[PDB]
Amino acid sequence: SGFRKMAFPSGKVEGCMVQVTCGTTTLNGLWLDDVVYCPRHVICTSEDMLNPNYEDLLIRKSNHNFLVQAGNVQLRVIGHSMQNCVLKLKVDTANPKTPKYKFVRIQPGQTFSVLACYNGSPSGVYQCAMRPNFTIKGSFLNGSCGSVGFNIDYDCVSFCYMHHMELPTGVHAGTDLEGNFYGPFVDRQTAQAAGTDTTITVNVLAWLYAAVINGDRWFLNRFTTTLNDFNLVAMKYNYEPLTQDHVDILGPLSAQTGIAVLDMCASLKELLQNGMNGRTILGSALLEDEFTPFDVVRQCSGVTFQ
Amino acid sequence: SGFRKMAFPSGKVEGCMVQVTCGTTTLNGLWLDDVVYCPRHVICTSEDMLNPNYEDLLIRKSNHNFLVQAGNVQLRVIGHSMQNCVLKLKVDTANPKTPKYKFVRIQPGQTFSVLACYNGSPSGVYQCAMRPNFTIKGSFLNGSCGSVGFNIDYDCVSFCYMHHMELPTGVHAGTDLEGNFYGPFVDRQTAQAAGTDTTITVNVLAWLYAAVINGDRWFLNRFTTTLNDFNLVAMKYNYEPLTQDHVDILGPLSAQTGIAVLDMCASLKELLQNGMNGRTILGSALLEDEFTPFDVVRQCSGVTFQ
Ligand SMILES: *CC(=O)N1CCN(Cc2cccc(Cl)c2)[C@H](CC(C)C)C1
Ligand SMILES: *CC(=O)N1CCN(Cc2cccc(Cl)c2)[C@H](CC(C)C)C1
């Protein structure tokens, strides 16, 4: 029993992190096969970030201007290209620890593990979710750029995030591994505002099912509700509207606990209106939305990986 | 910026997990050099656990009764011994991925990362703390026994915990790598009660310093207090008493934020008496005590490992 905010094992990702240095800027890179991926603002200076012309800046750089370093192994750049907001540095040596990887662009509400790195060296791992406003509430310092987010499907590593910048508000924004930003953000030092951050309702419901599995059942009430009447209350408290696809995903959790999804929605509706009365659920005084229904099933069944 | 419950990278530990099977019982083992460590109750059946005589049970076992499996590599046991509550299965092949390791027995209040495993395969990683009652609030299912807890000091892995059993109350108990249980627990299926679980005060203070670093300063008040008057209030709410050694550890955090330790204690005293007024600190509606002062300095400075 028990429930923890659990991250994936980072072993297969640690062997892919390298140190990228262009001039004076140094950040992290992802070494897969004979290609190194890194944020393109590594070619910028402290003064270029206010309004960078990346095309003009990249012209003044050649293959010998970039220095990729894998611990103590010195790599050599053969070709360089700019795919959207990431650089593709083609090197001579293929990474012998390249796992079965895959590039994926996740949707808001999904979760992934972040391997925070500095100077190409792993520092820590934590789990987080893509907020509805396409930001993440992570833990990043200067030099952590190039750190990647990922999921693991048995023997396959699914890279889905690369850290690019910290907003003036304290939240974090990045791209997929093809260089496309999550959200309307651009990689320049300017005031950029994120949208309203709402609560992932389908995740909260999965979290309540995990609570029933682990013994916390005080929030189970006598009432039921309709899908429209729940969304009417949910939108008042800035919650994502629940769809029929969300009910289908929660099917297995409903069958294991014997509690209908609409009955669980009625319990959540009463919690949103009356609060938590100073009590806790799974050791938390707030409603958590960083657990997808698949995360709950995975932790409550013991799913392993390669 | 940002603050997350961060675990250590698990790469160096993943390569040491093996599957141990004695008869019908199968759990996880730790393969370091040519020795495999695992809980000794792997030699028991479902009926032996009520009152096992491990010495008599181990006599009826030989070296060919244990089956250690490292993924797809079949190992062979040459000698077996029982050190307290763990088995030392001496094998023929030395683990080629054995890192610079070290066995340590942590004190209550310290934190470590847990690599939850099933059938010798890693499942997930999370950070937790040794409670004052020598239990941990983890996430373990059946078959997770043998999973280890660890810290990383640059290039050295410090193993400090091996999971042995789940109490009827839902909390978890285990041993160090020498087989000595943390707490007064014994490895048999009987009603065992843990002591009163108190709050690690020195950890809460370090967490409040992390909050000031990240912008949350609403809890900073006008008052100060004495070390005796704070402990008088702390013991009322089941908090660990603060010592002078705790003040010395919080020294660097005091110098970085410019806030005296006793001034931070006065803010905590008012929070314990008046509550949090429905507000949050670092996104939490409760006081967290699973961050040591070293954890805060590590995450707020960017400490990397090998
Ligand atoms: C992630 C990381 O290492 N950094 C975040 C900011 N980087 C520069 C920057 C500033 C403003 C906007 C953008 Cl898109 C990027 C920093 C890299 C070096 C120190 C210039 C650090
Ligand atoms: C950790 C783990 O795999 N298990 C916890 C309980 N194990 C048996 C048990 C029961 C009661 C007391 C003690 Cl010390 C140990 C289980 C191992 C097999 C299934 C017997 C599972």
XYZ file of C-alpha atoms in Angstrom, chain A residues 9-297:
289
model
C 13.956 5.181 -13.486
C 16.425 7.546 -15.135
C 19.185 5.061 -15.992
C 18.497 4.945 -19.728
C 18.442 8.757 -19.912
C 21.586 9.410 -17.837
C 23.736 7.775 -20.517
C 22.434 10.212 -23.148
C 23.177 13.546 -21.425
C 26.168 15.504 -22.751
C 27.640 18.968 -22.216
C 27.287 21.399 -25.138
C 29.404 24.564 -25.291
C 29.258 27.194 -28.047
C 31.647 30.039 -27.308
C 30.991 30.914 -23.666
C 27.492 29.449 -23.222
C 27.306 25.928 -21.784
C 24.137 23.857 -21.350
C 22.976 20.245 -21.664
C 22.434 18.185 -24.791
C 20.702 14.929 -25.681
C 23.013 12.473 -27.467
C 21.036 9.909 -29.479
C 22.778 7.873 -32.210
C 25.206 10.328 -33.906
C 23.091 13.459 -33.310
C 23.132 15.875 -30.361
C 20.007 17.905 -29.549
C 20.192 21.135 -27.545
C 18.379 24.488 -27.290
C 19.361 26.823 -30.110
C 19.887 29.775 -27.761
C 23.252 28.225 -26.835
C 24.650 30.258 -29.759
C 23.475 33.504 -28.130
C 25.190 35.865 -25.715
C 23.727 37.726 -22.750
C 22.960 40.666 -25.065
C 21.488 38.665 -27.965
C 18.588 37.287 -25.908
C 16.508 40.487 -25.974
C 15.899 40.181 -29.727
C 17.910 37.359 -31.338
C 18.016 36.690 -35.072
C 18.908 33.005 -34.849
C 19.413 32.616 -38.602
C 21.950 35.456 -38.748
C 23.583 34.245 -35.523
C 23.936 30.684 -36.834
C 25.636 31.846 -40.051
C 28.644 33.104 -38.061
C 29.082 29.631 -36.502
C 30.846 26.608 -37.997
C 31.152 22.960 -36.980
C 34.320 23.612 -34.960
C 32.613 26.362 -32.924
C 30.522 23.838 -30.958
C 32.130 21.641 -28.289
C 30.156 18.548 -27.246
C 31.515 16.724 -24.192
C 30.313 13.364 -22.837
C 31.907 13.273 -19.395
C 35.526 12.936 -20.503
C 34.988 11.797 -24.117
C 35.599 14.598 -26.623
C 33.218 14.508 -29.592
C 33.584 16.181 -32.985
C 30.795 17.969 -34.859
C 30.489 17.063 -38.543
C 27.308 18.941 -39.446
C 24.923 21.342 -37.744
C 21.331 22.293 -38.521
C 18.513 24.239 -36.866
C 15.152 22.465 -36.621
C 12.748 25.060 -35.200
C 14.071 25.927 -31.725
C 16.610 23.098 -31.319
C 20.024 22.498 -32.870
C 20.832 19.161 -34.515
C 24.598 18.731 -34.110
C 25.650 15.723 -36.191
C 28.724 14.141 -34.587
C 31.121 11.394 -35.687
C 30.659 8.926 -32.809
C 27.339 7.164 -32.292
C 26.260 6.880 -28.667
C 26.824 3.230 -27.640
C 24.188 3.621 -24.893
C 21.422 4.771 -27.252
C 18.226 3.032 -26.076
C 15.116 2.270 -28.089
C 13.875 5.864 -28.078
C 10.949 7.730 -29.605
C 10.016 11.400 -29.968
C 6.487 12.225 -28.792
C 4.519 15.442 -28.312
C 2.333 14.968 -25.233
C -1.016 16.687 -24.604
C -1.802 18.936 -21.618
C -2.672 16.854 -18.575
C -0.191 14.050 -19.235
C 2.705 13.461 -16.847
C 6.394 12.754 -17.375
C 9.654 12.528 -15.449
C 12.277 15.285 -15.621
C 16.001 14.568 -15.306
C 17.471 17.885 -14.175
C 21.070 18.210 -15.365
C 23.900 20.733 -15.097
C 27.027 20.676 -17.283
C 25.796 17.401 -18.763
C 25.715 15.691 -15.355
C 22.484 14.360 -13.794
C 21.346 16.131 -10.625
C 17.922 14.716 -9.763
C 14.668 13.269 -11.045
C 11.072 14.282 -10.337
C 7.596 13.791 -11.786
C 5.459 16.638 -13.127
C 2.524 17.320 -15.437
C 2.000 19.481 -18.509
C -0.355 22.189 -17.272
C -3.379 23.165 -19.396
C -1.556 26.427 -20.232
C 1.396 24.441 -21.672
C 3.740 25.306 -18.796
C 5.299 23.076 -16.148
C 5.939 23.782 -12.466
C 9.433 22.336 -12.243
C 12.693 23.003 -10.410
C 15.308 24.548 -12.707
C 18.337 26.759 -12.100
C 20.708 28.454 -14.529
C 22.458 25.869 -16.690
C 19.619 23.325 -16.459
C 18.541 24.115 -20.026
C 18.674 21.095 -22.291
C 17.364 18.845 -19.524
C 14.732 16.510 -20.923
C 11.411 15.038 -19.857
C 10.503 11.474 -20.704
C 8.256 8.471 -20.194
C 9.183 4.782 -20.345
C 7.055 2.167 -22.129
C 8.647 -1.126 -21.043
C 11.863 -0.985 -23.096
C 11.197 2.259 -25.013
C 12.076 5.768 -23.821
C 9.618 8.415 -25.046
C 11.239 11.853 -24.955
C 8.617 14.590 -24.788
C 10.170 17.759 -23.346
C 13.333 19.858 -23.424
C 13.697 22.782 -21.031
C 14.302 26.154 -22.678
C 13.453 29.048 -20.360
C 11.963 30.259 -17.089
C 9.153 32.799 -17.328
C 9.337 35.948 -15.167
C 6.423 34.434 -13.205
C 8.524 31.462 -12.043
C 7.008 28.732 -14.234
C 8.901 26.882 -16.966
C 8.430 26.474 -20.713
C 10.064 24.279 -23.317
C 9.738 22.409 -26.594
C 9.337 18.892 -27.886
C 12.342 17.104 -29.365
C 11.493 18.505 -32.813
C 11.926 22.046 -31.475
C 8.267 23.117 -31.373
C 7.398 25.051 -28.215
C 4.596 23.858 -25.976
C 2.345 26.906 -25.912
C 2.653 30.325 -27.538
C 6.109 30.977 -26.100
C 9.163 32.147 -28.041
C 12.822 31.725 -27.080
C 13.701 35.360 -26.446
C 14.119 37.460 -23.300
C 10.812 39.328 -23.279
C 7.720 39.582 -21.094
C 5.567 36.559 -21.971
C 2.356 35.729 -20.107
C 0.853 32.263 -19.786
C -2.879 31.646 -19.877
C -5.129 30.773 -16.973
C -3.969 27.549 -15.320
C -6.896 25.207 -14.657
C -7.111 21.964 -12.701
C -6.928 18.661 -14.605
C -10.243 17.168 -13.486
C -9.688 13.676 -14.920
C -6.454 13.504 -12.911
C -8.161 14.496 -9.647
C -10.738 11.736 -10.137
C -7.965 9.187 -10.692
C -6.303 10.458 -7.507
C -9.516 9.934 -5.521
C -9.733 6.363 -6.831
C -6.176 5.831 -5.582
C -7.293 7.137 -2.181
C -10.159 4.630 -1.978
C -7.717 1.837 -2.853
C -5.430 2.923 0.004
C -8.158 3.242 2.659
C -9.244 6.902 2.630
C -13.013 6.765 2.053
C -14.316 9.668 4.165
C -15.069 11.787 1.080
C -17.478 9.165 -0.309
C -20.937 10.718 0.031
C -24.550 9.643 -0.499
C -25.237 11.763 -3.586
C -24.907 11.246 -7.331
C -24.810 13.800 -10.139
C -25.027 14.307 -13.891
C -22.184 15.086 -16.271
C -23.652 18.510 -17.087
C -24.364 19.504 -13.476
C -20.816 18.533 -12.482
C -19.224 20.586 -15.265
C -21.393 23.535 -14.214
C -19.793 23.426 -10.758
C -16.347 22.514 -12.106
C -16.080 25.556 -14.389
C -16.917 27.801 -11.422
C -13.740 26.665 -9.619
C -11.538 26.692 -12.763
C -11.623 22.945 -13.404
C -11.271 21.340 -16.813
C -14.628 20.137 -18.196
C -15.132 16.379 -18.043
C -15.856 14.547 -21.302
C -17.074 11.055 -22.128
C -13.531 10.052 -23.105
C -12.477 10.874 -19.537
C -15.188 8.548 -18.215
C -13.992 5.741 -20.497
C -10.403 6.107 -19.264
C -11.582 5.823 -15.641
C -13.394 2.568 -16.479
C -10.841 0.136 -15.027
C -10.537 2.170 -11.819
C -14.330 2.073 -11.497
C -14.398 -1.712 -11.933
C -11.658 -2.333 -9.354
C -13.209 -0.146 -6.636
C -16.861 -0.786 -7.501
C -17.598 2.959 -7.523
C -19.238 4.568 -10.543
C -17.498 7.533 -12.159
C -20.540 9.778 -11.719
C -20.708 8.816 -8.038
C -17.063 9.849 -7.665
C -17.883 13.124 -9.436
C -20.580 13.803 -6.829
C -17.999 13.376 -4.065
C -15.676 15.803 -5.857
C -18.500 18.318 -6.329
C -19.137 18.373 -2.578
C -15.408 18.739 -1.879
C -15.195 21.751 -4.208
C -18.099 23.488 -2.442
C -17.476 22.547 1.208
C -13.684 22.218 1.203
C -11.758 19.532 3.058
C -12.680 20.555 6.645
C -9.006 20.614 7.629
C -8.650 16.897 6.866
C -6.304 15.224 4.372
C -6.508 12.729 1.512
C -3.447 10.516 0.950
C -1.557 12.893 3.227
C -2.487 16.019 1.251
C -4.673 18.950 2.290
C -5.267 19.877 -1.374
C -6.673 18.112 -4.419
C -3.840 16.698 -6.535
C -4.028 16.667 -10.339
C -0.542 15.401 -11.279
C -1.588 11.722 -11.448
C -3.105 10.433 -14.667
C -5.395 7.375 -14.558
C -2.521 5.387 -16.072
C -0.167 6.559 -13.310
C -2.593 5.264 -10.669
C -3.026 1.883 -12.372
